[PDB]
Write a protein that binds this ligand. Structure first.
Ligand code: CAC
Ligand code: CAC
Ligand code: ZN
Ligand code: ZN
Ligand code: ZN
Ligand code: ZN
Lengths: 327, 328
């Protein structure tokens, strides 16, 4: 009973404190190999990752799930290099985000299913590294292609037991349509995390989903453009709600009885080519702690607001363990 | 004077009979490495490309220019492998086609220039293989991003002497806007080929660009869905004009005195993931000669219509040599 990481199978107990939604680098397929100098160099990007992951490890983190797909420019050799150097387990993702190229965009459910199965069952590219999660996306009402991806993801997950995690536009309650399609396909909600759910203050939306058995991805806690409201690009990406506001959703879902179903993350990165230039310097200003932000700031904050230690252990250790374990 | 190929620099005279607009595999960045099974396997794609290239070489072809960009999933290692096994030179391209991912789409003119220069001056990825041509695209009126690509292409060309070749929607006369943007950047028209110009029967349009010194890319001669019109995807790709109708545009431009500005090609490929599934099968049934189509079918057609052998030699040998030669 194992979880696949970029360095091979680990037992469930080796996962430990897990960040369920992160990135080493948010990019585009082939981009890091073709234009490494965009990040200074490949090795500069690798060293910055290792630095961050090592700080994160010292704050308690033992595993990250990199939910970078093919079209987010996932580079599993990079993941494996920084994973070994930082001694942090990394889980790699299959699926598709919202920038699929034509060779993906034009594919059928059946073809998309073969591709996801391949990255899980056989390996990514020629590396033998197998994905341990499936990432999907909608950005409002699903496009016909995005529906095809949701159905292919559900099928790959039913075939392998590997779970599904999603990008939503939470302001458009995208989780509801994602849920309806997963349920028509036959996927159990306990195998699905509806992500970016911390982008909304609509508790009605989040409890309805948790009521139906979905894990709830509160995965962007440090994302805030408060204090640089005249950077339009950064305000659009990070929002104008505080990290405290986002984190209090964690407490709120615990008070409604759903601690079992929460997954907490930073949605951090060491490189971000698929947004405006120098966004990574803006982000690093806003949250200097990077991936360490959850353990160093958010856990202590929840403790101080009356959340018991056993509860936080369950969210940061047991919820990720149950979710990632294939079933 | 030298041209960069996927096996290093060659002299002008080694290029010989050159197809200026071809593909080994039309795809998407990273796609061939992530999902080789789409093409059967990497081995099966290479086998088919080497066979098709040896077929082309036996008909007289010595060089092709693969105008597959980054976002067309150009794999220069595949290009090196098949170039060498078939003993046909391949010129690799930089630039961007019309499926740029976000990491390209959001870049400034300056950033794109630096990217194109990297692939010409240094190499593609970590291979040391340098691009010998810059490929760009509009599909209608230029988007803001495509405008930035054209300007970045002009600046890369000006700095390196490497020529620019374009994708157009010919039916919307894109080459007119492409020309204005390039000229606004001070690029000489003789460094520019306006491609897919055989997709239109608009001689007024084509002769006006030729008059301004542009090279005219008649690059899809075997492309035709006549006979299989009820295949809607193939019809939209290949069109409802015969290969002979396309080839007669070559004769038309020669007749108007523009033999020196014509570039003829097949726009062929050995895999095509960035269109509908099994399109390769439709295309191969239409044109089984693949890249040998120009020398075995089009050159004898134009001879029978009274075009002199010396003019066909100019168009297939001299025009490419002059266009590909880096010239500042
Ligand atoms: C790469 As993201 C902003 O969708 O987590
Ligand atoms: C790859 As094409 C059909 O624009 O030559
Ligand atoms: Zn997302
Ligand atoms: Zn993310
Ligand atoms: Zn084209
Ligand atoms: Zn082409």
């Amino acid at each position: 009973d194992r979880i696949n990481t970029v360095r091979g199978p680990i037992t469930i107990s080796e996962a430990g404190f897990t960040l369920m939604h992160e990135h080493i680098c948010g990019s585009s397929a082939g981009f890091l190999r073709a234009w490494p100098e965009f990040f200074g160099s490949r090795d500069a990007l690798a060293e910055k990752a290792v630095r961050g992951l090592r700080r994160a490890r010292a704050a308690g983190v033992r595993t990250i799930v990199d939910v970078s797909t093919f079209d987010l420019g996932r580079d599993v050799e990079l993941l494996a290099e920084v994973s070994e150097a930082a001694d942090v387990h990394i889980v790699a993702a299959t699926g598709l985000w919202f920038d699929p190229p034509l060779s993906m965009r034009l594919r059928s459910v059946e073809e998309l299913t073969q591709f996801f199965l391949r990255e899980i069952q056989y390996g990514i590219e020629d590396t033998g590294i197998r994905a341990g999660i499936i990432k999907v996306a909608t950005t409002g009402k699903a496009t016909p292609f995005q529906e095809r991806v949701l159905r292919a993801a559900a099928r790959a997950s039913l075939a392998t037991g590997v779970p599904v995690t999603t990008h939503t536009d939470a302001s458009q309650r995208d989780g509801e349509q994602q849920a309806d399609i997963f349920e028509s396909e036959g996927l159990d909600p306990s195998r699905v995390c509806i992500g970016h759910s911390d982008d909304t203050d609509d508790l009605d939306y989040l409890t309805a989903l948790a009521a139906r058995g979905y894990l709830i991805g509160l995965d962007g806690i440090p994302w805030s453009a408060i204090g640089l409201e005249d950077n339009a690009s950064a305000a659009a990406l990070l929002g104008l709600r505080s990290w405290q506001t986002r984190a209090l959703l964690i407490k709120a879902l615990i008070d409604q009885g759903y601690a079992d179903q929460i997954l907490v993350s930073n949605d951090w990165t060491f490189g971000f080519s698929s947004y405006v230039t120098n966004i990574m310097d803006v982000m690093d200003r806003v949250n200097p702690d990077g991936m360490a932000f959850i353990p160093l700031r958010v856990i202590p904050f929840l403790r101080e607001k009356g959340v018991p230690d056993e509860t936080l252990e369950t969210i940061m250790v047991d919820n990720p363990a149950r979710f990632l374990s294939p079933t």
